[PDB]
Amino acid sequence: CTFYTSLSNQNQQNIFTAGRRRYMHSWDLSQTAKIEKFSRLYGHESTQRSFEN
């Protein structure tokens, strides 16, 4: 897991996390949490089996 702050728009904050799974999560930054899932590699799915590293 790791924080991420866009270099240009400092107001932007985000948290990326991954595991032994074929998808990645991103959390934008208090009733709810805005969570988006990256699960598309655009044709290179064979080369990538897990987003763990």
Partner RNA sequence: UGCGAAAGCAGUUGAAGACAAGUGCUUGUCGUUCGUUAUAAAUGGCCU
CB of 23 to RNA, least distance (A): 7
Nearest residue (CB) to RNA, 31 versus 48? 48
Residue 34: half-sphere exposure toward Cβ, Cα within 13 Å: 5
The least distance separating RNA from the CB of residue 40, rounded to whole angstroms, comes to: 5
Choose between 34 and 44: whose C-beta lies nearer to RNA: 44
Binding site for another protein (CB under 8 A): 26, 32-33, 35-40, 42-44
